[PDB]
Curated annotation (Swiss-Prot), chain A:
GO terms for molecular function: structural constituent of ribosome. This is Large ribosomal subunit protein bL32. Residues 1-20 are annotated as: Disordered. It comes from Mycoplasma pneumoniae (strain ATCC 29342 / M129 / Subtype 1) (Mycoplasmoides pneumoniae). GO terms for biological process: translation. The keyword Ribonucleoprotein applies. Belongs to the bacterial ribosomal protein bL32 family. Residues 6-17 have a biased composition (Basic residues). PANTHER family: 50S RIBOSOMAL PROTEIN L32, LARGE RIBOSOMAL SUBUNIT PROTEIN BL32. Keywords: Ribonucleoprotein, Ribosomal protein. One of its GO terms (cellular component) is large ribosomal subunit. Signal peptide: none annotated. InterPro entries: Ribosomal_bL32, Ribosomal_bL32_bact, Ribosomal_zn-bd.
Swiss-Prot record, chain C:
The lineage of its organism: Bacteria, Bacillati, Mycoplasmatota, Mycoplasmoidales, Mycoplasmoidaceae. Pfam families: Ribosomal_L17. This is Large ribosomal subunit protein bL17. InterPro entries: Ribosomal_bL17 (IPR000456), Ribosomal_bL17_CS (IPR047859), Ribosomal_bL17_sf (IPR036373). The keyword Ribosomal protein applies. PANTHER family: LARGE RIBOSOMAL SUBUNIT PROTEIN BL17M, RIBOSOMAL PROTEIN L17. Keywords: Ribonucleoprotein, Ribosomal protein. Part of the 50S ribosomal subunit. Contacts protein L32. Belongs to the bacterial ribosomal protein bL17 family. Signal peptide: none annotated. It comes from Mycoplasma pneumoniae (strain ATCC 29342 / M129 / Subtype 1). The keyword Ribonucleoprotein applies.
Curated annotation (Swiss-Prot), chain D:
Transmembrane segments: none annotated. This is Large ribosomal subunit protein uL14. Part of the 50S ribosomal subunit. Forms a cluster with proteins L3 and L19. In the 70S ribosome, L14 and L19 interact and together make contacts with the 16S rRNA in bridges B5 and B8. PROSITE patterns: RIBOSOMAL_L14.
From Swiss-Prot, chain E:
GO terms for molecular function: structural constituent of ribosome. Belongs to the bacterial ribosomal protein bL19 family. The gene is rplS. This is Large ribosomal subunit protein bL19. Keywords: Ribonucleoprotein, Ribosomal protein. GO terms for biological process: translation. Gene3D superfamilies: 2.30.30.790. GO terms for cellular component: cytosolic large ribosomal subunit. It comes from Mycoplasma pneumoniae (strain ATCC 29342 / M129 / Subtype 1) (Mycoplasmoides pneumoniae). InterPro entries: Ribosomal_bL19, Ribosomal_bL19_CS, Ribosomal_bL19_sf, Translation_prot_SH3-like_sf. Pfam families: Ribosomal_L19 (PF01245). PROSITE patterns: RIBOSOMAL_L19. This protein is located at the 30S-50S ribosomal subunit interface and may play a role in the structure and function of the aminoacyl-tRNA binding site.
RNA sequence: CAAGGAACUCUGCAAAUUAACCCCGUAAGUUAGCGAGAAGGGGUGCUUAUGUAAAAGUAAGCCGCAGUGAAGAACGAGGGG
RNA sequence: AGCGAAAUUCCUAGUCGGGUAAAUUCCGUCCCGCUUGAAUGGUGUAACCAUCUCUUGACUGUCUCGGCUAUAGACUCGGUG
RNA sequence: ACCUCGAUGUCGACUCAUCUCAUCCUCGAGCUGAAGCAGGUUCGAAGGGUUCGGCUGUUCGCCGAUUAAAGAGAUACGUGAGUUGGGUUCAAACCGUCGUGAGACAGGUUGGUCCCUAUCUAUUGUGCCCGUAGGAAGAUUGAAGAGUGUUGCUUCUAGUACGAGAGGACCGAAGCGAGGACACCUCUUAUGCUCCAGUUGUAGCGCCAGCUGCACCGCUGGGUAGUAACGUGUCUAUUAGAUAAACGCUGAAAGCAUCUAAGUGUGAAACUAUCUCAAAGAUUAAUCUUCCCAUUUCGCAAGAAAGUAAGAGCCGUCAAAGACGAUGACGUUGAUAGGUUACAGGUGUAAGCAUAGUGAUAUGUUGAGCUGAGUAAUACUAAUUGCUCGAGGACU
């Protein structure tokens, strides 16, 4: 393991171009009508009607 | 030599005693009569073979193109298909009765996909040696170490091409020959075959006439345990 | 290796499983990792099913899986389970508890899930 | 599998006590010690009353193996001890009153000289 | 399509036996084995105590040890095997299905044998 | 980790076994101290009764893979400087 | 005097006996002592050595002949770097 | 002393081998003061193999043991960004020799400081997006590649021939071998630490019992699925071609002979395939099949709302898959995983009661109890009623 110079600038960005974070495909909520995300809980808390998450 | 073929799934490993003071592990392969997808006579196809479909699934679990070709060819929706080569004597909608097309004693070959192993060491699939297991010096016991190609001014000052390094090990469709035939069960359309088949128990098993021999029938070695009280 | 934190061990895992199953029996809702929820629910439902035979042999058999809490203790937990929790669960052949997947945790971005017991 | 330098007692009535392998007859990386395999031995301990010099390099045939041997008939004959017989110049033993059983795995190779007088063949 | 895995046993209806008594790993039995050299066929009544009684239907193997000239000779046989006759002699009591400590047992030092 | 037991090399270096207590036994040499706890062998669990201040122990019986039962215990012998 | 290929021998792997199928490792044996050798003392010596050598019983993953069980790193994820 | 002194780690031991043939054999053949077997030289000739020990720091060197075989050369006398260092290029302690002397002995016994978190090219497998050119889903193939290209004994033919006899075959057929590959771990092994059981101390579960923690995980014996091997099955062939060594045929130069001048066949373990496997980013994008698409009017031309419907993807369950990706099935109409029950299979008569026992305890209840993976029913639980890219022959 050894290197004899420093890295470039564009290739450095290309290496960091593969470091993109994960994406999130949102989903609509029929339980309450607010924003939500797929396979997760809603904002109000209702799930299969079963309201389970408290806002406060 | 029109090499007949048959598909199935290996659904068991057993051991059946035979003659000549020996026992032979006899596996079982289960399948159902398949439906031919088509035939190829070599004039522009560049080879002669027969595409056969199998693993029939229900209609709502298949894409429109393939299933549409299936009903247009008088076939049911199937999950898989493959071409058996050097064999074209098919007719349309032929239900596969393998116990008649294959006798009880020929030496046949079997193709199957192996069990996947991912990224493993080099002692498997290449069969090399490892470092010092003991003897009390340092802490190496399994490594490659020497990968020398040249160390100097112009000896090689590079590396060779082609690596005997295991990639995604396992799950490769390979054909092994010299498998004998043992018996048949028409009730379940199952075939008892000498020797286990590669891959997970239940994987694809293709049985065809072998190339090492043109098919030599051997008699059944009578060792059935009819010894009751 | 030199002296250090041993990470996580099977004994620790089973002890944590016992801790959470006793806690959820005490209250009825526990937040955790989904993997741990799947690990715990097997023993949880097996024990609930065992509680429906209603004999002292079951009382002996279930004793190696109960821990105390601030509100209740092992004896109180087992008596409550045998008296009121079990008679409700005679109308379901398994699937006694429910796990609901929440959002990621705010400390390590871990998939969180809340496990509760509802008939 | 027994490798080398192993000590074993005698079975045929010859008059020796301890013997050790001096040359394993076979091939490179044989790594197997099945029965009926000829081997070259040296008598590590021969009392003077016997007919074999102590340390005489001679030919033996192993009839018992503490390692064992997996039978392919579906049965399995296993020995818990290592024993052999000293063959004199073709296949015949130097002992007469055979003591202990002998395996049938060497019957396929003949050796009727030993098996015509042994106690039992298994 | 479906693999019931009952076909494992549905094909075993050929290699089975019903003459073998149900014994344990602490019982003394005997078995006659033929030795056919094309004439003067011998019969070996190999007898002794069992050290393992286990099987899965085709894996029904068992180990039996005899003492000849002081030498303990142990042989294993599959239940589904031609040219055997498993004749039971006496049944003791054992706690495990595979034991190996009795090879050190000798006369006036063996375990108590059940009637 | 079945089996080989130092065959790998200068290669017995971490590697196993002997251990606590109790009862025999212990070679050569010795300047008479030793060697020596040489080396080599055997027992320890439970119950009953006896011992005693208890202690081990004692006699009878019991079991199984064991009975310092887990955690704590010495490998050496011979030749040369 | 003593010992002698030495804790030291160019010729040397000198030679003999044995352990060793195999042994400049070990011991003793002879001696043109290149250049051994009594107060930079010798010969041998009684136990012992957190020294080495070889033989021996005992213990083997020491290799035959590979890994196993689980973690710890490792690898993805989030925070710092 | 040409090139490196502002380094370009040199003996090893080790795993891996690679290249050459001026080869040891497995090959074929020529000839031989080759009666035959057993032979010897040479030719074409590198596909493959060419071991296990002690001894010397030592790959140098001795012999031991076999096999058809224990061949030689080059890789920094191969490989310390691969590991300890045994002499040797750290020290010294001691013997001997020598210098008047600090000290030298390339003589001798002993010990003896090996760091590197992988940047780029090759590189093992997969990936982000894109192309395969109306869109999408498949089926293919074979330019070029890889493995396979190893090999002995016994029996029959055959003690037949030859040779007075001894000695004693070359060919072919079968079995058995060795190494290696491939598969499964049905049998057996180590292992299978939230499985069971024997099982002791201590301290907890109110106490006796029956549980619990630690004692490796208390030790020990087994064991579901499953890993691997020492577990068991196969294979090294046949065939189309072709020169090579050698024999040639007709046959001239050189009125014949003469393999050569035209072709011809016999024709090497070697060569190309036949055997097995990936493969069109193989842009030489090669070949084929299927499914889908039809709302004027503008805007640098076909979108002004239709904007896949063919499908694929985000996400969850799975998973014998498995560094993350990854591919495959399921997505509620869903048996896709988990659960309840049942089964395979394994552990082993559960606790308690009763009888005898003052009491260690023996028997019945009981083939009872139990378990993480293997199997079956079962929507009992979850994967719900979601979101993104994504239709019109642009061009020959």
């Amino acid at each position: 393991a050894v290197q004899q110079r420093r890295s470039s600038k564009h290739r450095r960005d290309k290496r960091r171009s593969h470091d993109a974070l994960t994406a999130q495909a949102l989903s609509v909520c029929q339980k309450c009508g607010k924003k939500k995300l797929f396979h997760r809980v809603c904002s109000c808390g209702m799930y299969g009607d079963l309201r389970v998450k408290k806002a406060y | 030599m029109e090499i007949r073929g048959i598909f199935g799934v290996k659904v068991g490993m057993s051991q059946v005693f035979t003659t000549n003071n020996e026992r032979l592990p006899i596996t079982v392969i289960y399948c159902e009569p398949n439906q031919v997808a088509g035939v190829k006579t070599e004039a522009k196809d560049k080879y002669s073979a027969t595409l056969l479909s199998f693993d029939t699934v229900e209609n709502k679990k298949l894409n429109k193109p393939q299933q549409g070709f299936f009903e247009k060819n008088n076939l049911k929706p199937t999950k898989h298909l493959q071409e058996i080569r050097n064999m074209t004597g098919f007719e349309m909608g032929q239900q596969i009765t393998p116990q008649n097309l294959f006798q009880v004693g020929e030496y046949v070959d079997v193709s199957a996909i192996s069990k996947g192993r991912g990224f493993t060491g080099a002692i498997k699939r290449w069969n090399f040696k490892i470092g010092p297991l003991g003897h009390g010096a340092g802490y190496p016991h399994r490594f490659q170490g020497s990968v020398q190609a040249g160390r100097g001014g112009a000896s090689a000052q590079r590396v060779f091409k082609g690596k005997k390094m295991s990639g995604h090990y396992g799950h490769e469709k390979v054909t092994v020959q010299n498998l004998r035939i043992v018996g048949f069960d028409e009730a379940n359309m199952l075939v008892l075959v000498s020797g286990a088949i590669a891959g997970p128990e239940g994987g694809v098993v293709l049985i065809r006439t072998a190339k090492k021999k043109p098919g030599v029938v051997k008699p059944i070695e009578l060792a059935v345990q009819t010894e009751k009280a | 290796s030199y002296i250090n934190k041993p990470g996580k061990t099977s004994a620790w895992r089973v002890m944590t499983v016992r801790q959470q199953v006793s806690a959820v029996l005490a209250y009825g809702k526990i937040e955790t990792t989904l993997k741990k929820a799947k690990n715990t629910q097997k023993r949880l439902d097996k024990l609930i099913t065992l509680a429906k035979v209603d004999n002292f042999n079951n009382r002996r058999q279930v004793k190696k899986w109960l821990l105390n809490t601030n509100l209740f203790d092992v004896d109180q937990l087992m008596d409550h389970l045998f008296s009121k929790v079990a008679p409700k669960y005679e109308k379901t052949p398994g699937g006694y508890s429910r796990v609901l997947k929440l959002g990621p945790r705010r400390g390590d971005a871990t998939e969180m899930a809340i496990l509760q017991l509802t008939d | 599998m027994v490798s080398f330098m192993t000590r074993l007692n005698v079975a045929d009535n010859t008059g020796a006590k301890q013997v050790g392998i001096i040359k394993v007859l076979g091939s490179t990386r044989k790594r197997y010690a099945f029965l009926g395999d000829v081997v070259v031995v040296s008598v590590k301990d021969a009392i003077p009353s016997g007919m074999v010099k102590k340390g005489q390099v001679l030919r033996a045939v192993i009839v018992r193996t503490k390692k064992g041997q997996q039978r392919k008939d579906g049965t399995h004959l296993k020995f818990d001890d290592n024993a052999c017989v000293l063959i004199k110049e073709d296949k015949s033993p130097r002992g007469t009153r055979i003591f202990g059983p002998v395996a049938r795995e060497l019957r396929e190779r003949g050796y009727n000289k030993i098996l015509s007088l042994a106690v039992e063949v298994v | 399509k479906i693999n019931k895995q009952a076909l494992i046993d549905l094909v075993e209806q050929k290699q089975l036996k019903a003459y073998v008594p149900e014994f344990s790993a602490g019982d003394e039995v005997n078995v006659a084995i033929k030795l056919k050299e094309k004439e003067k066929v011998r019969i070996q009544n190999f007898t002794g105590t069992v050290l393992r009684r286990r099987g899965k239907g085709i894996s029904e193997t068992f180990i039996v040890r005899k003492t000849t000239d002081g030498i303990p000779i142990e042989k294993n046989f599959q239940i589904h095997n031609p040219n055997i006759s498993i004749e039971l002699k006496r049944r003791g009591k054992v706690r495990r299905a595979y034991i190996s400590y009795m090879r050190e047992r000798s006369g006036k030092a063996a375990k108590i044998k059940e009637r």
